[PDB]
Design an enzyme around this catalytic site. Sequence first.
Site, PDB file in Angstrom:
ATOM      1  N   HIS A  61     -82.512 -74.391   2.885  1.00 15.55           N
ATOM      2  CA  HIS A  61     -83.301 -75.504   3.394  1.00 15.55           C
ATOM      3  C   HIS A  61     -82.474 -76.337   4.398  1.00 15.55           C
ATOM      4  CE1 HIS A  61     -86.162 -74.379   0.247  1.00 15.55           C
ATOM      5  NE2 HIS A  61     -85.219 -74.604  -0.668  1.00 15.55           N
ATOM      6  N   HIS A  91     -76.231 -84.102   3.399  1.00 14.63           N
ATOM      7  CA  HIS A  91     -76.855 -83.060   4.171  1.00 14.63           C
ATOM      8  C   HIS A  91     -77.595 -83.711   5.359  1.00 14.63           C
ATOM      9  CE1 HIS A  91     -79.964 -84.541   1.468  1.00 14.63           C
ATOM     10  NE2 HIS A  91     -80.774 -84.351   2.508  1.00 14.63           N
ATOM     11  N   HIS A  93     -81.137 -83.314   8.238  1.00 12.10           N
ATOM     12  CA  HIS A  93     -82.391 -82.766   8.697  1.00 12.10           C
ATOM     13  C   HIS A  93     -82.368 -82.798  10.209  1.00 12.10           C
ATOM     14  CE1 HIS A  93     -84.095 -83.303   4.590  1.00 12.10           C
ATOM     15  NE2 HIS A  93     -83.210 -84.282   4.560  1.00 12.10           N
ATOM     16  N   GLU A 103     -86.409 -87.656   9.687  1.00 13.39           N
ATOM     17  CA  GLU A 103     -87.442 -87.826   8.680  1.00 13.39           C
ATOM     18  C   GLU A 103     -88.024 -89.246   8.787  1.00 13.39           C
ATOM     19  OE1 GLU A 103     -85.853 -86.163   4.942  1.00 13.39           O
ATOM     20  OE2 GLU A 103     -87.141 -84.485   5.584  1.00 13.39           O
ATOM     21  N   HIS A 116     -78.284 -87.705   5.340  1.00 10.42           N
ATOM     22  CA  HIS A 116     -78.551 -88.278   4.036  1.00 10.42           C
ATOM     23  C   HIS A 116     -77.319 -88.137   3.139  1.00 10.42           C
ATOM     24  CE1 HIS A 116     -83.113 -87.636   4.577  1.00 10.42           C
ATOM     25  NE2 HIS A 116     -82.653 -88.707   5.199  1.00 10.42           N
ATOM     26  N   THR A 195     -87.107 -86.403  -0.240  1.00 13.47           N
ATOM     27  CA  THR A 195     -87.978 -85.870   0.816  1.00 13.47           C
ATOM     28  C   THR A 195     -88.136 -84.347   0.745  1.00 13.47           C
ATOM     29  OG1 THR A 195     -86.280 -85.513   2.455  1.00 13.47           O
ATOM     30  CG2 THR A 195     -87.233 -87.763   2.357  1.00 13.47           C
ATOM     31  N   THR A 196     -87.511 -83.727  -0.249  1.00 18.21           N
ATOM     32  CA  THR A 196     -87.748 -82.310  -0.532  1.00 18.21           C
ATOM     33  C   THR A 196     -88.262 -82.183  -1.946  1.00 18.21           C
ATOM     34  OG1 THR A 196     -85.392 -82.148  -1.177  1.00 18.21           O
ATOM     35  CG2 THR A 196     -86.022 -81.441   1.019  1.00 18.21           C
TER      36      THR A 196
HETATM   37  N1  LIG Z   1     -83.666 -85.179   1.448  1.00 16.56           N
HETATM   38  S1  LIG Z   1     -83.397 -85.880   0.078  1.00 16.56           S
HETATM   39  O1  LIG Z   1     -84.300 -87.090  -0.024  1.00 16.56           O
HETATM   40  O2  LIG Z   1     -82.037 -86.301  -0.005  1.00 16.56           O
HETATM   41  N2  LIG Z   1     -83.949 -84.951  -1.151  1.00 16.56           N
HETATM   42  C1  LIG Z   1     -83.102 -84.469  -2.058  1.00 16.56           C
HETATM   43  N3  LIG Z   1     -83.677 -83.515  -2.874  1.00 16.56           N
HETATM   44  C2  LIG Z   1     -82.869 -82.940  -3.957  1.00 16.56           C
HETATM   45  C3  LIG Z   1     -81.752 -83.782  -4.493  1.00 16.56           C
HETATM   46  C4  LIG Z   1     -80.958 -84.538  -3.456  1.00 16.56           C
HETATM   47  N4  LIG Z   1     -81.787 -84.851  -2.280  1.00 16.56           N
HETATM   48 ZN   LIG Z   2     -82.472 -85.276   2.976  1.00 21.28          ZN
END
Ligand SMILES: NS(=O)(=O)N=C1NCCCN1
Ligand SMILES: [Zn+2]
Length: 257
Positions: A61, A91, A93, A103, A116, A195-196
């Site tokens: 991802h 990570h 995006h 995002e 993030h 957001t995932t």
């Molecule tokens: N893009 S994000 O909001 O950070 N979403 C995440 N999903 C899994 C756990 C850590 N982060």
């Molecule tokens: Zn993220």
Amino acid sequence: HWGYGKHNGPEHWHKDFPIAKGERQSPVDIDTHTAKYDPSLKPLSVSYDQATSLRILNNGHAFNVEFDDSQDKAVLKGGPLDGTYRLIQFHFHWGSLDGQGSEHTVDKKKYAAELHLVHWNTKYGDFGKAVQQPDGLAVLGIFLKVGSAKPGLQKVVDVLDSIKTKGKSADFTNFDPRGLLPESLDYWTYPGSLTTPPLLECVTWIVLKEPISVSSEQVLKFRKLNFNGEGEPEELMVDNWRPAQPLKNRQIKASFK
Ligand SMILES: NS(=O)(=O)N=C1NCCCN1
Ligand SMILES: [Zn+2]
């Protein structure tokens, strides 16, 4: 399984993850005129001097730079937060083109990418318990615009060739995430979600106002990563962002006048 394509992307996630249509989903558009300065807020305390990075992973991802979170070593405190949040990973995006990839949006503007830094609240003991709590996580979001190179990003860019495909990882010790921060810690904050998938509504979002600048060559190397595994047909890892979601009954607060 979920992804960012037309048949498994953001418009489909609600079937497996009905909270996708919940009351505090992320990201959102930050309307700068509507956000309100909150004098009750404090400065963000970002204490990353003892951070211990371990590994970088292509998870199919994005890529995660992972940290040792077995002790208070890299923590976020202050601002809207109570107590202490430990850095576990960061990570990004990003887009296929420089005009998209973030995002969050700012007055509907899309940045080329968004960083993030994910932290969990130490009162819950670890990350898996923290995600089951409404104040379990704090994510520090930083926009990336294309311009001059960010020197502190180059070690990340240079390791990406070794994690091209899904499931590949590499040692990534001795990385200093202080080099990914802008000068100002002015921010917006609101209650939201991952957001995932699983899109859990556990996040206090803290989005910095000042973007960092990265070079076109740095973001071009993000776009050479692959969503697929080795041996499979190549699918470039681009456009791994969820669009803005309805704000619903939330207020975005600003730390700055
Ligand atoms: N893009 S994000 O909001 O950070 N979403 C995440 N999903 C899994 C756990 C850590 N982060
Ligand atoms: Zn993220």
